[PDB]
């Protein structure tokens, strides 16, 4: 019992965090292999006025780095530029870089973040990418660099976000490894506006099965709304369309419960809870995907 959002042991890229600094400004970067990638800001003369990347970077002399993992010195050999990251060619390759791919995230993909401040991490919490490719994150000054990632069932590390962007709202926006910016936002201290962030439908669905599946029933309406109808009402109330039906036939089966009477109940719920709870939030909750539900129910 219980659902928790929770993040995948840290590990494995734990090893892979260290410290980038380019001539006074400091950040993070990850090493795998004998490359580093970091975030190419760390060369900008500031990073509070526009920059011109393409003057930083042919201005940029490799003395200026001081790559280093947990105070031990790096050599730099080289570096490139790729969108919005660079990858640094050091002399030492990293012994512990774990088995891994690089992946691009989609909208309404959970991931991990760990956090870390100049090469060392202080915290790991679970995430999603909203419909806007924003996060809600816990990032401040020196966060830039921290990664995020996935771990695959075979233990695959997929390295998939990389820490850029405070937007003037507060949410926060990376880059994936190849240096795309999530959302194609831009990699400057401009004011930029995110869309407005669209509820996750098809975690909300998630949801409302572990609530069924651990006693709490008191908000099911009877009623029920089909995909279309659902996908229409959304539209209108903030909410994305909801996927195949049959994505969720395990948890149907396992509850009694069709998936169009919890689309019913999310449209009633939408009004409030009349100071009720489930499973103890107040109001409805997108934080968890159905995957993490039926392994958080299941998956043993
Ligand atoms: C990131 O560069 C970082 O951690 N840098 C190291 C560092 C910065 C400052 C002091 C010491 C060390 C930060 C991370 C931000 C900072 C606060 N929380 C974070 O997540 N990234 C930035 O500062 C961005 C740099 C850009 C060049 C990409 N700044 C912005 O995203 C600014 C946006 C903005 C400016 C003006 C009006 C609206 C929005």
Same mark, same amino acid.
């Given at each position: 019992?219980?659902?928790?959002?929770?993040?995948?042991?840290?590990?494995?890229?734990?090893?892979?965090?260290?410290r980038?600094?380019?001539?006074?400004?400091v950040?993070?970067?990850?090493?795998?292999?004998?490359?580093?990638?970091?975030?190419?800001?760390?060369?900008?003369?500031?990073?509070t006025?526009?920059?011109?990347?393409?003057?930083?970077?042919?201005?940029?002399?490799?003395?200026?780095?001081?790559?280093?993992?947990?105070?031990?010195?790096?050599?730099?050999?080289? @570096?490139?530029?790729? &969108?919005? =990251?660079?990858?640094?060619?050091?002399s +030492?390759?990293?012994?512990?870089?774990?088995? %891994? *791919?690089?992946?691009?995230?989609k909208?309404?993909?959970?991931?991990?973040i760990?956090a870390?401040?100049?090469?060392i991490?202080?915290?790991?919490?679970?995430?999603?990418?909203?419909?806007?490719?924003?996060?809600?994150?816990?990032?401040?000054?020196?966060?830039?660099?921290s990664?995020?990632?996935? @771990?695959?069932?075979? &233990?695959? =590390?997929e390295?998939?976000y990389?820490? +850029?962007?405070?937007?003037?709202?507060?949410? %926060? *926006?990376g880059?994936?490894?190849?240096?795309?910016?999530?959302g194609?936002?831009?990699?400057?201290?401009?004011?930029?506006?995110?869309?407005?962030?669209?509820?996750?439908?098809?975690?909300?669905?998630?949801?409302?099965?572990?609530?069924?599946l651990n006693?709490?029933?008191?908000?099911?309406?009877?009623?029920?709304?089909?995909?279309?109808?659902?996908?229409?009402?959304a539209?209108?109330?903030?909410?994305?369309?909801?996927?195949? *039906?049959?994505?969720?036939?395990?948890?149907?089966?396992?509850?009694?419960?069709?998936?169009?009477?919890?689309?019913?109940?999310?449209?009633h719920?939408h009004?409030?809870?009349?100071?009720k709870?489930?499973?103890?939030?107040?109001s409805?909750?997108?934080?968890?995907t159905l995957?993490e539900?039926?392994?958080?129910?299941?998956?043993?």
């Amino acid at each position: 019992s219980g659902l928790k959002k929770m993040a995948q042991p840290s590990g494995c890229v734990e090893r892979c965090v260290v410290r980038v600094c380019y001539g006074s400004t400091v950040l993070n970067g990850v090493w795998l292999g004998d490359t580093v990638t970091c975030p190419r800001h760390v060369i900008a003369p500031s990073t509070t006025v526009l920059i011109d990347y393409d003057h930083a970077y042919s201005t940029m002399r490799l003395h200026n780095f001081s790559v280093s993992h947990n105070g031990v010195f790096l050599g730099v050999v080289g @570096v490139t530029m790729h &969108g919005s =990251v660079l990858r640094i060619k050091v002399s +030492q390759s990293n012994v512990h870089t774990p088995k %891994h *791919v690089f992946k691009t995230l989609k909208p309404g993909d959970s991931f991990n973040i760990l956090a870390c401040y100049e090469g060392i991490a202080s915290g790991v919490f679970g995430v999603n990418l909203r419909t806007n490719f924003t996060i809600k994150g816990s990032f401040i000054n020196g966060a830039c660099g921290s990664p995020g990632y996935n @771990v695959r069932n075979d &233990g695959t =590390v997929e390295f998939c976000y990389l820490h +850029q962007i405070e937007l003037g709202s507060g949410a %926060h *926006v990376g880059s994936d490894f190849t240096g795309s910016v999530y959302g194609n936002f831009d990699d400057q201290p401009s004011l930029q506006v995110e869309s407005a962030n669209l509820m996750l439908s098809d975690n909300v669905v998630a949801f409302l099965y572990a609530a069924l599946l651990n006693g709490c029933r008191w908000w099911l309406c009877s009623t029920r709304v089909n995909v279309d109808g659902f996908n229409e009402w959304a539209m209108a109330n903030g909410y994305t369309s909801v996927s195949s *039906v049959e994505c969720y036939s395990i948890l149907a089966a396992k509850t009694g419960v069709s998936v169009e009477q919890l689309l019913a109940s999310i449209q009633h719920l939408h009004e409030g809870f009349g100071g009720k709870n489930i499973l103890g939030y107040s109001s409805l909750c997108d934080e968890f995907t159905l995957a993490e539900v039926v392994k958080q129910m299941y998956g043993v």
